[PDB]
Design a protein around this nucleic acid. Sequence first.
RNA 1: AGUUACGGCCAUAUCUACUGAAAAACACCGGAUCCCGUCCGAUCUCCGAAGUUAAGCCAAUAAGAGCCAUGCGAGUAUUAAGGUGGGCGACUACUUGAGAAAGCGUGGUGCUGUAGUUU
RNA 2: AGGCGAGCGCCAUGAUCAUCACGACACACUUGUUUAAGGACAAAGGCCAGAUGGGGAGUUUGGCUGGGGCGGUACGACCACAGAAUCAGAACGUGGUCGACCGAAGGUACUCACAGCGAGACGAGAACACUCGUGUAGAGCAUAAGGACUAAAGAGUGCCUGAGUGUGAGCACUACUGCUUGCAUGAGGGGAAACCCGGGCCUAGCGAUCCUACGCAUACGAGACACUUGUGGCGUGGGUGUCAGAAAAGUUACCACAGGGAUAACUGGCUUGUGGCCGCCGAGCGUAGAAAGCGACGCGGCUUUUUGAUUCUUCGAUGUCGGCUCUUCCUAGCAUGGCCAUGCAGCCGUGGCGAAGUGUUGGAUUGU
RNA 3: GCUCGGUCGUGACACGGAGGAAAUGCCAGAAAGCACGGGUUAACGGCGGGAGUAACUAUGACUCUCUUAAGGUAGCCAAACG
RNA 4: UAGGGGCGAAAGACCAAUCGAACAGUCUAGUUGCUGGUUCCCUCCGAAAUGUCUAUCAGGACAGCGCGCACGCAGAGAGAAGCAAGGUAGAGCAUGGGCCGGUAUCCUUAAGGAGACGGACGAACUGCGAAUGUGCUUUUCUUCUAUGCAAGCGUAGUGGGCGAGUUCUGGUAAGCAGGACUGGCGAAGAGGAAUGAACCUGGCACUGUGCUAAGGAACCCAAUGUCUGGACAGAGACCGAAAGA
RNA 5: GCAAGUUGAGCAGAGGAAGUCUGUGAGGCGUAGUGAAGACGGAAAGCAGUGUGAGUGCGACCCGAUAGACUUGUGAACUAUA
RNA 6: GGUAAUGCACAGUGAAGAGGUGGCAGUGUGCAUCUAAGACUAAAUACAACAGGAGACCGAUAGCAAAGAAGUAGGUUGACCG
Lengths: 100, 156
Amino acid sequence: VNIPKTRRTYCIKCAYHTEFKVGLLKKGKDSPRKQGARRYARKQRGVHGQTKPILKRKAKTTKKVILKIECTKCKSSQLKVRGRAKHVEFGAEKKVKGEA
Amino acid sequence: VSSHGYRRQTRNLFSQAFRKHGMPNTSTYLTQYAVGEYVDIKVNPAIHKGMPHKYYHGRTGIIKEVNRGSVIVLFNRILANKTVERKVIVGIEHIRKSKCQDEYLKRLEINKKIIEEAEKKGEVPVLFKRQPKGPKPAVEMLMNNIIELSYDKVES
RNA sequence: AGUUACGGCCAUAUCUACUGAAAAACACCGGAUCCCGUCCGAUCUCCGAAGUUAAGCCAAUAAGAGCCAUGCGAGUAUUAAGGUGGGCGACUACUUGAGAAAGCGUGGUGCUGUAGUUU
RNA sequence: AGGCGAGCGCCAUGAUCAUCACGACACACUUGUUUAAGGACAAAGGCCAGAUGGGGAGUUUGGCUGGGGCGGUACGACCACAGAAUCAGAACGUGGUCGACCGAAGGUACUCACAGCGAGACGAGAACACUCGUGUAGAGCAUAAGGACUAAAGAGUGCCUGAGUGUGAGCACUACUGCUUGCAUGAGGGGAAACCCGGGCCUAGCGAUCCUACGCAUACGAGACACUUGUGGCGUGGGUGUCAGAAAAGUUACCACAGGGAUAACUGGCUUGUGGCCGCCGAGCGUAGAAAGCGACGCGGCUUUUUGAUUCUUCGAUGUCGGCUCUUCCUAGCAUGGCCAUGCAGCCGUGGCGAAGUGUUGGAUUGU
RNA sequence: GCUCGGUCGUGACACGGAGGAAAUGCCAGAAAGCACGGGUUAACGGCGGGAGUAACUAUGACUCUCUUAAGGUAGCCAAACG
RNA sequence: UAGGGGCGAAAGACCAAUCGAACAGUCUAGUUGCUGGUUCCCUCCGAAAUGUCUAUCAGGACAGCGCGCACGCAGAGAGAAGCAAGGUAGAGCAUGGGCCGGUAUCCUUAAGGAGACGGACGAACUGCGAAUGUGCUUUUCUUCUAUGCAAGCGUAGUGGGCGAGUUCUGGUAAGCAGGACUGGCGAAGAGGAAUGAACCUGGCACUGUGCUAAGGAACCCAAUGUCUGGACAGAGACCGAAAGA
RNA sequence: GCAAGUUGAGCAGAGGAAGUCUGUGAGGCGUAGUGAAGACGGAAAGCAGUGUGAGUGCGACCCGAUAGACUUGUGAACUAUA
RNA sequence: GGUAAUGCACAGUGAAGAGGUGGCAGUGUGCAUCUAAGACUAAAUACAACAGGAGACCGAUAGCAAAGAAGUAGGUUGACCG
Ligand SMILES: [Zn+2]
């Protein structure tokens, strides 16, 4: 699947159509200071073994394509969801018809 | 085993009749509908928006609400041994005006005359009910021109 | 009464040969300077009247093909209810009811709405 | 505080604190070398942290199934067939498909067809490019199957990113999911305009609570006030295919317990494919000649003595193969008695009929 | 599997470093192991297929071909192992 | 030398008639979706063995079918009369699949091929199309109806079914395995088929007199005789095929 | 029984007394809802008892495992070995 | 219950004379409230043996195991059992 690097679309904050910059969303790093991390650290602490379950019988191959789009004027962001695909490319050459 | 998609088992239903393929006729689009009319569903397979589920094909119901190019029709259905009302959205290409009230409306037109006179002259209407066909009538016959019948045909 | 513009129901209107047609139309027809579009003024777009009923459109003809109706096929095929009916079965007779199709014969061959024009 | 290369890093040595070997003493510590020998090492204790660890400890080792196991997946989805013409409707019933793919194969406006067949046109042939006439789809429509489509939904050509943003109501047995439809908005798109568009012509391509990542504004914050961290709310992603969602390998012939004829290993019952026995027909063969004796290719039966198929009875128990011993019954007749046919000279036979009274043995190898 | 040698890399806590008002984080550091190179079967164990070819026929000493960590030697056999 | 321990010329042998983990006592009345049992009378009403989800298949929960209390009340497991939808039985072989033979004529060969046509066919072929069954409106439409219906609230049992008639799928079949429709036995006695869960007649408080059903009427055993044809086989009343004199 | 209200909380005063009568006097639920919250606000008789059907937890209708653990409890008079 | 530590310990480290706390981690600053690392204390509260009084309790297969010479007759190698 090929996606262009730019898209003119409606910006909710500006309340009219504007140019946006287009790219794949990126998963950030887990923080030790959140309530879930704190709870788990304390529970693991003693001689208690493994205290929470871990998935082993996994089954899926792909994961869902998700695009982050940024408004060039006001820097606000929107998230667009596009379904499952094994491979993604940004800004490659057009699928020109009637090749040799 | 069978499957359970939205258009399961519709090979015979949802197919055009012989020498009747193509889009609908102008009369379909120029018919005006109103709340409270009785209407009859027959799906046109060539139109892919506003199709009802195939249970409703060939059933008749009553118009509840009217929109730009679609209608909402009320139906009743038995589920788990109880009666349930159902509100079905249909596009105007898949409906025709029902004939089921025709005779009753004629009878009302006759009643509407009598019920006025019944205030002036009588006290109660005669009301013009239908009656089922009675016994066989009496006959007077001239008795010339007799025809005899016989087992002449041997039927080898 | 036809035609023509815009229609309704979508073959009684289709397909193949032939033949007719006052008037007014409808056409074929004559050019590309411009607007517009082509490998190509063939098609599409524009500007025109020297010609012509040869064509189309309209109408007639044909033991024509196809379509539409009706009669017959036929109370035939199949079928609902019933009995301590029959048959080793496969299946089938009877009593009170409902009731076809293909073939084949005979007839048809568009009907109409609103406006405009022509003895 | 010195020196090098167009104040930089690089090369010299001079002051300031830890610090690793090596020596030489004896004071901790060690040893019945004890009025002694070793010596800050050893050996022995303590607190944290990595590695190894069936030596042990706990526990687990899905379901459906013509009994279980091995095999398949009827375990989540989609089309067609059948189920005596609404809808629904079982079996490890039938023919198949799915866990994706695509900036166009998405949205709009306009133009024109196609597969073939009959004539033509140098090289040029069965099969090269160009034309004329016919052409209801005999073609195409990415990917199963069905349905749909003709001045198009197919093939080309132009422009666009609606594969917008808030918030309602409903349909499929309706939670998740998929689709249909209302109102409001965009310094939205395509088209002259009427019209159409919030993915793919329609029916399939998918996933809760808690935790965590990101986007969006509006909240909270402990006696008070400021900031760095944190906690709330809505929406999407990260995943459970056993697909309405536990974190999981074997073996027991040393074996235990609760139950089951809801379910196997005998017999019996129903069935008779397979096993065995009998009829019908007459192509050919028999030295001539269908039929003394045979009888291809086909067709109809009977039996329960073989082995299957099924699970009705028994799992708080019906003692399981063969032999020994002893009795009775059946006939589809091997001998013995009476007869008929003959390819019956006689002798020996072969095919059939009524008949179950009396007979049908001794041994070698082998559990048979 | 056991055993021997070196690090070239990885690999804990402590001990340091930079920054910030401070917490939390970040960076360095890092034995033995692991990786890497050798030894070892009276350690666990393991030890092949296909074609042609000799003056009757058969059989193949001989040839070619695929393959490996090595392709079952000396003996023994329808053996309590066919 | 003592129990997750001993001892063993090794058999999981032996450790007070106990050993593939001793005895005593306690926690403890451990747990059980599994087996057994569960104590007086009469009156009235009366089921289910099906759907969805479940580490679910000998169990649960939700819904469906009972009963009790009942605010209230024009309704109905039947017909007519207008109106819709359907692709089965029959019938056919016009698109698609597909068997055998063709006159004239045509094409070549001097073979064969095509053919104006006839016969034979499909669960996944259709050009036509029933009966029976399904839904809508009308009491302004016959006929019944209070000793009747009944929202709502609370709560039970059930979730192994089996059989007849008519039909269907798998299988050589089966008292075999699995669906659909209308009544049964389950939970149903009485009279009849000699006997039999389900077949025929026909639904049960307690007495008395009459009458009929189904099935019987020489005798067993309450009631029996008549007329007309067939039939001779230790036949038939109870009973098997193709083939035959 | 009382009703926009209601109640035997504990505890005090009286009384030849485990009864009864009287006080003082909390709390709880109700008198109207909406949101996570900041915040806002606009329908519906309740409270306490005496009993019956029914759910959940405790031995939980009655009887019934093979097993698991704990003791500063016992045993080599049978049998094993020094 | 105590949630970026409610209390108690062990090893390293280790104060100030001024310190501790104000149910969410950190740094600063006012405000409120207390004074740890030494000791003693009545009343109102809990419950066997033994004694006394009561009861909608049981009545010799019941009620404590035991209404008489009952933890007895009797039993285990023993602990213990009855
Ligand atoms: Zn913006």
